[PDB]
From a paper:
CRISPR-Cas9 is a powerful tool for genome editing, but the strict requirement for an NGG protospacer-adjacent motif (PAM) sequence immediately next to the DNA target limits the number of editable genes. Recently developed Cas9 variants have been engineered with relaxed PAM requirements, including SpG-Cas9 (SpG) and the nearly PAM-less SpRY-Cas9 (SpRY). Here, we combine structural and biochemical approaches to determine how SpRY interrogates DNA and recognizes target sites. Here, we show that SpRY binds diverse PAM sequences by forming non-specific interactions with the phosphodiester backbone of the target DNA.
Based on our kinetic data, we prepared cryo-EM samples 1 min after mixing SpRY:gRNA with NAC PAM DNA. Since SpRY lacks a PAM requirement to bind DNA targets, it must instead identify targets through probing for sequence complementarity to the gRNA. The 0 bp structure reveals that SpRY interrogates DNA targets by introducing a ~50° kink in the center of the target duplex, distorting the phosphodiester backbone immediately adjacent to the 3’ end of the gRNA spacer. Interestingly, we did not observe an open protein/linear DNA conformation, suggesting that this conformation may be too transient to capture or a product of crosslinking. While the 0 bp and 2 bp structures largely resemble the Cas9 binary complex (RMSD 1.88 Å), the transition to the 3 bp structure requires the seismic eviction of the REC2 domain.
Author numbering: 3 to 764, 925 to 1002, 1042 to 1047, 1074 to 1364
Write the structure that this text describes.
Amino acid sequence: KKYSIGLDIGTNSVGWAVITDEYKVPSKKFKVLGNTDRHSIKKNLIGALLFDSGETAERTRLKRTARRRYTRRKNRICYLQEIFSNEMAKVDDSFFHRLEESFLVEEDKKHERHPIFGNIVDEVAYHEKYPTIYHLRKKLVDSTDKADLRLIYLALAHMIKFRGHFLIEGDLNPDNSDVDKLFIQLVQTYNQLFEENPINASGVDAKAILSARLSKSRRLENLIAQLPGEKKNGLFGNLIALSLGLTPNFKSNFDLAEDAKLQLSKDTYDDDLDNLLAQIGDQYADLFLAAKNLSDAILLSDILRVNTEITKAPLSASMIKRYDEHHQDLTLLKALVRQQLPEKYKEIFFDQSKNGYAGYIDGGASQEEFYKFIKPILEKMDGTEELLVKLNREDLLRKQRTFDNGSIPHQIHLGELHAILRRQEDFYPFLKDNREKIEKILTFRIPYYVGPLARGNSRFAWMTRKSEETITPWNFEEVVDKGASAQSFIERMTNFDKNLPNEKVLPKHSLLYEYFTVYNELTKVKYVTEGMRKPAFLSGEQKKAIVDLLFKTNRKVTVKQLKEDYFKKIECFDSVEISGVEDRFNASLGTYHDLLKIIKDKDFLDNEENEDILEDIVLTLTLFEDREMIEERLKTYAHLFDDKVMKQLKRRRYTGWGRLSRKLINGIRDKQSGKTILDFLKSDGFANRNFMQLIHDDSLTFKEDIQKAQVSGQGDSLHEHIANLAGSPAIKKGILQTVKVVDELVKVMGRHKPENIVIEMARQITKHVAQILDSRMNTKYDENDKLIREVKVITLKSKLVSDFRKDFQFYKVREINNYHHAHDAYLNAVVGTALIKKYPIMNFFKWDKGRDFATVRKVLSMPQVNIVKKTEVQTGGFSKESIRPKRNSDKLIARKKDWDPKKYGGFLWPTVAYSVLVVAKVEKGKSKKLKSVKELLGITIMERSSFEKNPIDFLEAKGYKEVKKDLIIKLPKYSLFELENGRKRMLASAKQLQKGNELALPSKYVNFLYLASHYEKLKGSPEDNEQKQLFVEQHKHYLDEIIEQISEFSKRVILADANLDKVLSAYNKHRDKPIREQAENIIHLFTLTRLGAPRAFKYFDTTIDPKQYRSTKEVLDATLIHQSITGLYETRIDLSQ
DNA sequence: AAGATGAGACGCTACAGTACAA
RNA sequence: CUACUCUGUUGUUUUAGAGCUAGAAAUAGCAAGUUAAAAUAAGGCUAGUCCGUUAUCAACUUGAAAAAGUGGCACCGAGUCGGUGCU
DNA sequence: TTGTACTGTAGCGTCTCATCTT
């Protein structure tokens, strides 16, 4: 007999169903492996796999880069100690040794407890002389006297370890670091983008306004007041507030559907900016970048407040002044609270839990929380005018290591490091010998294009070596082949075109790409001028003319400029209405105007044989963000132009990639027409042809050749094909599990294949699913070259299946039980066969109209549907990530080997990888005798490697003895057990279970509950609504029988009898409620019965506190069930042994 | 009438903590 | 529409920064507080300025591993699958 | 000594909704 398969693909589930030609589902007798007596069972061939959503690589990449950063910083410290080592050993033998073991408690610290000097007296003198590191730093910059080599090392190591940012490249100069120059660049960019309505911001004194020691909103209002034409809630006002560090809302400027709630200080700023630019386009990206640069300058001015130039170290002197302010205001607050409000003195300065100063220094209170707490207190006192104004300025009692330090460039630390290396240069000869070496330790940065410095073992690295020497910051210029590593970087980072997988995607700012966008916008353009009767798209001569006069002249072409500067100017048209476009084009020749601004030679850009050159420079500036490699790749065009245009062109950067490849836009050519895509866009293209049209064209040769290219190369083996596919990894998990359930269903059906497999995806991706099945499913060949397609593969829309449900009263209810995925799988199987047998269009359902509707109603009414919860070994972090203080608890996990956690504190809440059933012996508590024992042991992700190497030694280290090795069973999460009377429990961890059963509530109750749920919103005809509503009111005895279904089901498999007493009482108190209201409270009620974790739910008077099943002992003698991915094949292990 | 801030509660759900029971 | 490369700032934990006056302590009065080190998944061997939280994983048999195999069909019922005939 | 019911605690941070200011 022949059979067909239907599927329901989801982000958390795969529905699957087997159908006969007669539209019945088969039910078959299955063999059981394992030691139980129940050798054979009956199952229906319909069910659904359930699993957790697939996680992204994002978190893993963050932790990976953090690990790399930590390793590299520790290596920098190692390099500095290696330089200092010999002379340090001449000065102090155990200095670095005392430094590395500073963490350990004194009882197992081998050296003296005092890190720097080793004696208490010199430590007291040091801490009194320099209460902060910045006092030492300013001394070491501004003193010519000889200093101790230890303090030299502390200053240099503090600079190198915390070295500041590299966003400014080259030397620190006012063109890229002062507030006035980047304010001028911001307003020049703003006037360049908004050519109409510019701002005459050149009259403003930006340094006096933005660098003023004034409250930040009041500073914003000061800058707005100097600019009469624009306001605070204008766009420019919002970028100024954003650059100051407020949280403006660009929704007011771009009329977006959602808040553009940007703020630079938040860690997730960048993502919010990409979501904003995904809406408003990429024209504005560099504008927000300029605002970010201005913010870096502003906040740097708020740190480096010592502009008096008497010192050589501005940062050190600024932090010393900040400490002095903190000390003075600390004394003044102590005095003022002591004399005016004595009742709160101990609350502020001693109670470190309660958000005061003691909470702000000794506790966990942030600066924002401290200002939240202390500001109302300051308003209640005398003399606090000086202090509250500093709080308004955010300048009161400031710490030195704060969030604002992220704007400090590495050139500032480099300058202070250079000052100390110069001041003590003659006193210590090895600083004179190793000045450039230490400076290179600070200044060296691994480029983007080099990647990790692996020796071939890493998955992520690509660089190529000129020598097998170990890489250091000093030999990097000669060990890594920078050219070859750069070439490998280009090879790896180039995305392939989804439409043409052999070809690389063009850069986003490619000139060819910009022409494609402009001509695509303009073939869609159509217009009526006053001299003609009916609209037409612009001709190719017209298209060329508008591009030449307008798009090659202005960065933002708009319909007004069309009408005045082309149609009246050239075509002599009195008036034109251009129906086919927006008021202003989003597409632009932006990069052309950029390069025209840089190199100032329009004829060089119009000269067509230069096109390879400009595409190469645009590709270079898009790929690389390191100035040296940009110089290297631009060497080949130093002869085309030279001096200022080169020096300025080297500074330009671009971001992102286009949608399409060169071979697609202006490569492939129609055999009939002799035109490319770009030719059809640029010419008339018959009457009209958009890019999308050109692609989805039946006449054009493109549609067949692009498919013939798309099936090639991308048709890899299964897993690597899934990795290449487009989508978030949850749907990738779904598709791969889909392929596996198809493989096991064709495994189970006598190795006979189906004839139809039907897909629904809850999109382009579904065609690749069909291709995956097409290439997996057919491998035979006949004599000639043609392929054979022996199974039909069909795609169904969800909307039509939903209409099938609602028309014939096959109403889905998604939350009574998990059978629905299998039920839509059966439904699109039915329609997928029906469609292809009717038409080798839904109206012929309104096929045997008597028998087949009864058959599908019977199939939906069936209570045995194969739910399979995918058992998964858990992966992720070892525990919750916070580090907790010392305690007398055995539960804490140590952070290193030697660090006994009761001394040092550690992590908590570890995550179990899988549980293991162990049969062994254990010492009886009141004796030493070995009692035989059987139990579940939890294996956390940390211990997984040690157990999975050698189980026996791990179990004996856990304390077990005489372990029966063959009896140990790997039990992942959601391992399934069957308890008494058909009760089922799933293993969530070694200490907790979850309920497994589902209430297969009969279809009459499902239809009743659906119609009662939507009782006022059925949306049918009034006859249809009346007929539906009269069903509920004549079966209203159901809202007792539904309660006495859940009562019986709970009394059988949900042992929470105290809760059942509560709700049945709560039901009886509230039986009087209206029909829909009680019906949705029963919809809420099935949470007690539902598969998964026990979870709270709401009823009329009370929320029912769920009974957690917090003990796993009752499964240790049950029938453990191993289930195949379809759940059809099983292995049942009776643990009563 | 629109944006900022402030925080009740939605509670994911498994695993400390404690008292408690044989 | 995934994926990847670089870097910075915080936060957390333990120690160092001698607390001082009373009192047998318990506990009160007074002062003091801004920083530094080290760690930031335990760790691993290929000893790399690398890797370690993504994807993948029912069981059994054979294999170090990638991986191959392992489970009769109708009929009739449907409280999570059961019953009957053939084999 | 030894297996139980109850809080609240994380990685929190939205889902929710109310008032003050412009």
